[PDB]
Structure formats: C-alpha cells, structure tokens
Amino acid sequence: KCVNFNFNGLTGTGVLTKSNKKFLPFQQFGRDIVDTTDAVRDPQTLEI
Amino acid sequence: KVTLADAGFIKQYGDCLGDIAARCAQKFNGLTVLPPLLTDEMIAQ
Numbered sequence A: 001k002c003v004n005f006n007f008n009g010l011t012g013t014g015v016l017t018k019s020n021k022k023f024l025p026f027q028q029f030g031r032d033i034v035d036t037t038d039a040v041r042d043p044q045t046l047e048i
Numbered sequence B: 001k002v003t004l005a006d007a008g009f010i011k012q013y014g015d016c017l018g019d020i021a022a023r024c025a026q027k028f029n030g031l032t033v034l035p036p037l038l039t040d041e042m043i044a045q
C-alpha cells in the first residue's frame, strides 16, 4: 500500500513490496539506473 | 526495422518489476509520453 516511511533516516513515500534482489551482506540501500533509491534493507528484519 | 523506445501506453502495472526503473523517467520523475491520435493501423488505412 502507499505509505510514508523512514528506514534508518532514509525517508520518503511509496509502496513497499517483496524484493527479489539479492543484496550482499554489507549493502543497506539499493539504487536504480538514475541514481535514486529503489530498495532498502529493513533495519530490524534485514529483508530487502 | 525501427525500434520505438517510448511507445506510450498504460505502464503503471507494467512498471512494477524487480529492476523497477527499467529505463525515459519511467513516469516516476514526472516525464511521460502521450499516445498519438492516429494509431499505426489508422495510418496504414
């Protein structure tokens, strides 16, 4: 659903869904082709 | 022979993907493309 969110200081508005991206253990944020954030690691569950 | 990259349609359901941006704003940054009034079939006619 479209919610506001704040993930460890990164804030914004959007719909959060299950990702099929595989982040390596040191990665916290992901970005798309245009250098805007498009995925996060949950600070508590570590799900992408 | 000609590949048209924009080819505007209803792409919000299309946009959701693993690599969401897939692109030329993907609509999200405020840039969209309107369809032509005459479709390719109408021009062919």
Ligand SMILES: *[C@@H]1O[C@H](CO)[C@@H](O)[C@H](O)[C@H]1NC(C)=O
Pocket: A043, A044, A045
């Ligand atoms: C944070 O605490 C919760 C408590 O249930 C735990 O399940 C979770 O794994 C913890 N996360 C980290 C990163 O320690």
